[PDB]
Amino acid sequence: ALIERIDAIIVDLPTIRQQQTLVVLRVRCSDGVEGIGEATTIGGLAYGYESPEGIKANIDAHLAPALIGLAADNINAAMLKLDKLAKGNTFAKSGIESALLDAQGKRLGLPVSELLGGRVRDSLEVAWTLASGDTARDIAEARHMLEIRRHRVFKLKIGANPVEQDLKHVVTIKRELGDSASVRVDVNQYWDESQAIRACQVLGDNGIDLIEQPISRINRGGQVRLNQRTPAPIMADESIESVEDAFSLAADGAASIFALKIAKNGGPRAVLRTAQIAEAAGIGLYGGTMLEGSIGTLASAHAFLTLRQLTWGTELIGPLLLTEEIVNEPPQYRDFQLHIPRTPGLGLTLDEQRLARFAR
Amino acid sequence: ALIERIDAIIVDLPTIRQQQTLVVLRVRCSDGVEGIGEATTIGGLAYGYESPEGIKANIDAHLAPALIGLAADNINAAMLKLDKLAKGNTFAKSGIESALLDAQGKRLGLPVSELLGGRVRDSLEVAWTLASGDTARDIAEARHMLEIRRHRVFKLKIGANPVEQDLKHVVTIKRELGDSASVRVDVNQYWDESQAIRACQVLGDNGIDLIEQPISRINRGGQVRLNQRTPAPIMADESIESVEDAFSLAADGAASIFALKIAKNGGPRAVLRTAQIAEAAGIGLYGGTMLEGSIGTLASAHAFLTLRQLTWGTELIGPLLLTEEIVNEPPQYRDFQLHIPRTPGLGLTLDEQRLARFAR
Amino acid sequence: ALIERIDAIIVDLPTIRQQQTLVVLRVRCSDGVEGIGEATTIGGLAYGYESPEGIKANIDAHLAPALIGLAADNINAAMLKLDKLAKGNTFAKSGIESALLDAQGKRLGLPVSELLGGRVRDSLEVAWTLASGDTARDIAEARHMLEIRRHRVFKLKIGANPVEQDLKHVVTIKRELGDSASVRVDVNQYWDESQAIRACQVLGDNGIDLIEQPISRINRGGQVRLNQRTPAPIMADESIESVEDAFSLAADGAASIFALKIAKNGGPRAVLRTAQIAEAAGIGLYGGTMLEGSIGTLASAHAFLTLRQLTWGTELIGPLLLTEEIVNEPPQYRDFQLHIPRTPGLGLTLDEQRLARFAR
Amino acid sequence: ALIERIDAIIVDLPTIRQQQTLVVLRVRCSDGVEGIGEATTIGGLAYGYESPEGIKANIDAHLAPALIGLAADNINAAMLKLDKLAKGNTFAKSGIESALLDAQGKRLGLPVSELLGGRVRDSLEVAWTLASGDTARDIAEARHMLEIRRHRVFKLKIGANPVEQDLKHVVTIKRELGDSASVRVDVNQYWDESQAIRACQVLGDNGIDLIEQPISRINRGGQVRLNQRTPAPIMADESIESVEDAFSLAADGAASIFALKIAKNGGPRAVLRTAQIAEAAGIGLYGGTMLEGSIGTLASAHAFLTLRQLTWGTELIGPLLLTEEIVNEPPQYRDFQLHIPRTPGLGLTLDEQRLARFAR
């Protein structure tokens, strides 16, 4: 089996919020098997180097031509060839690898998790991001998600408002929920170390379980210092933009938890390299997401099932934010977790109608 | 346009406290344009290496003669020539650079902030130093400044009295003001690390937002340790006596905030080098002052407007302490900020009458 | 003056050894002034994250729309707005900044170097890369360049062949040329630290003046160790992919020389931030290039003229490799240097005919 | 005895190679005893923060008025009062302290060395700076100084010419002299670490005994690295601008030898603090000079005699460069050393005629 054609499709799907833009990869193999992948980001170029437009342009002009004609079954050789001719471009590489893994799983009749070694679980705990901006509305959304047993872990994106305001908001939510839920925050690099010093103390003293990426990745020593002084553990996300970054942060002791994202590492196999690094150092794990639809969510999930332990769960909620999908199989969210079937590949098939409907 | 003449005038102005001594620079260019600058310090030689007397002596004998005849429009070449023949002498260099930037802005019809790249704001938040020594009098002054909306951020100079006394004073002020104001302290290198250990803890636990230069610049490790243990962030001021010092402190992680002072770095362009260093490391900013009159205040301000972010505001209140000025344009303080116009140069002109009146 | 339109044109120019692809930016301002910039790389995605295709796609979809309507004269505000909405994308940002600086220089009648503060020199020393692969042919090319007084500094790209082979080649060239020329090498991250240990020793012992980027940027400690043990100084290039990286490498002591590249930092102003960082730490400078044509070469050059010192010269030879250009003014290479005129902006104008001829 | 009057006199003396400017201090005490001191520098502001003009201005306006009326016999109280009201200003402080020590020695009938604890030697080894610029001329001067037994240790100021040129020059001199003389160099901060790496190797491999201040004081890590890799020991000079700097460099391991200069530390007593710091760390000593005339030379010498060991000798040759002096007692240079008598104070008296003749 050889790689015959690779198509990168930009798709715009409506959300429950606006719209989320996905880049759907379709890799056609000579044996008739097709693999699907996804390379999605949030906000164009605001949360990463790659945009949907840049992703497609590079796949069409550089990445795809390098794979046409190669063995579809030798994923390692294929991905290494891409590393040789393309620096960075992890999101694009992630979609491509997901597609190849999908096709290979359909080919051998195995789920991607098994191709990756074997799953140790069939479901993953999912955290919900409360984003209404209104405290009361957030507490209500949280009590609802707990009632229908969909989520018991909650994440709050803070940092865009005055520090004191975000702190009042977060503390009130953890106060009202008590130990019924786990409350975590994500500052998305919005604070500088001077703001984080007091902020981390207040959050940790008020029952917040973890503070995700409080300060910018450019401030390495700041991360190392906060990792030593913050009452609540510090998790790295944006600081990891490659597997090599994870090693660096581990050797430095810059975070006690790593967020694992296939798009930021280069694919399901790459994210496993990062997880292995963290495991060798004693660093806790969390399954992250770039708000991908089902393809990317399942591609991530399949990799997370092989992990010995994910101390802090995952946030694979991307499909729940979309009102329309481009796959035929809707994800199974029940009892605070996401359930992954044992069907071949990613266990998904494209809805050609909706794909054509939402493709730009 | 060539530099024709440079005059350094020592001026003694009365304050609302005593008197403040300024060194006014007047640079005459062959195209008829004149630039004005200021090199001021506090207390002769008590807060720095340069005194008004030493500043004038060096400008007349060494610095000025090196510039006469050079292109007034090539500020870089001019300032680099001064670095080559004069070690240190940052205050004097600061006045000279401010004067050249002023003249160049009048020449091209641009405000100094635009010569420096472009402003991202038109006003700066100003902090007021409560200095009566009497707690009740300070709280009263603070409630007054809040009422007329002039200041909502306050700074207290402590360290000259027994530690416990200064702590009682500061805590009482923050207590009475509540979260209506931001209270910060400046110890002016008065404590040794042994005194600061408990002092910083008490201050941080009682709502003080930042502790400025608690210990001496000679104790580097002490700064690094306090930066790691103080509940309230540590800001460096006296430790920065050059741009290279800022790099050093950044690499060491000796403070999470840098005070930017044109006089301590060598001018508006130099202070920007320091700010860039701090930005590259994730270090927060604050616009400092050496209690300069309008010339030096505006020269500082014009540089601070180009900054992406000044997390902790500024303390450009120098003109408010003087009862008489030597410029014709009084500064605009309204709604807790200092407002900077878009007029050419520094946007100031000398009052020849008052200058002659207060010159010694 | 407002930014009215921005066009990103991919141009393919033939070289003396294939073709080089440039992305020409044309920024049209409401006052009728037009600025030109360039965002070029080598080998698609092999020497960086950005390809010509990705660069254009991002400019058309994200970067340009954010600037239309803003003041063309406030470059700082414009570039900071880009940092706020786009992570990375330094090559694209570089072309845009070069274009804005060009237009602003034509507008005020000043050369870009003066907009950047003022030049301290009018020409820059240029190094030539011997790339024939054949030792005898390289020595011949070097003796020729010396005869016509075009180059007296030479750089050799090594690392793609067995270590011993590359070493024999380099040592032979330095031997035949003697102290008539300066011989330097660039390994382009090709070696791992284990290979570099002996390689750096042999090179340093045989008169090679500097070893550029011997090992990969992922190996930080390796860089710090080689910086301490290599008999010949170590220069960082690929390790700097941002201004913040420069600070990091400086604080770490990972290289004694920094290669300055506008494309890797984000523009002429950004490259100056990096240079300032290195200067504050005592790190030597070298003017690098991404093999840009005249636009990018001049944009770089104009920034390097403001530098106090460039201990190791530059490699602004890009135009000499192209057989055809898209500008009307050919660069002046005479007496081992590149000469930069004092004309407004970049001092260049587009040849509409050739542009149309080579645009794809 | 009280301090009645202090006079700072700028004196211009002709040299054997121009003119050297001294600031002579005369402190008059109520008991009729007068003390003389000297605050001299090289090149105005090129080798330090203080110029003769700035030194006099600060003494007349700030330093002197703080001492009038105090006990002339309590030097500690007097010098500490100066530290309290004046930051830096070490050259000025040095002249004043030398004057007070002089007067106190005449008063008690003891040589300054005894006031400082007691001498362990009566003479100091003196090194000669070969400065003709011409290699042959330097070798000739060195063979002459050896013949008349005046100097057997030689220092070469390098760094202003291309590295290779300075290296050829130095190596030739050490080669021709052989082990008849000790050859050392002083780079006066002229090189950056990248240039020093190879330069220090060549110098150390060719018999140069020590390399003084190869790189700038701003590059701290560079000093620490060179201290570890240079085959010839590294001596710090400009890096010490205060006693606290010495501690810092010692704790860092930035140099294996410290140059002791009374002007850079604040006086004969201060220089002893620095020497004590180096001794406690195992750092070797060298008696430096700012090219002072006899007053400053003797003030330095008297302090160096109390030292347990000065591994690398001294460079107290200042008087030998002047054609005219302002004291009545010429210094005794015989048998490679400077001989210090056991007369009271500094053992010098002013020649009122020549003083009046050369005072400006």
Ligand SMILES: [Mn+2]
């Ligand atoms: Mn995150």
Ligand SMILES: [Mn+2]
């Ligand atoms: Mn302060």
Ligand SMILES: [Mn+2]
């Ligand atoms: Mn390179």
Ligand SMILES: [Mn+2]
């Ligand atoms: Mn020296």
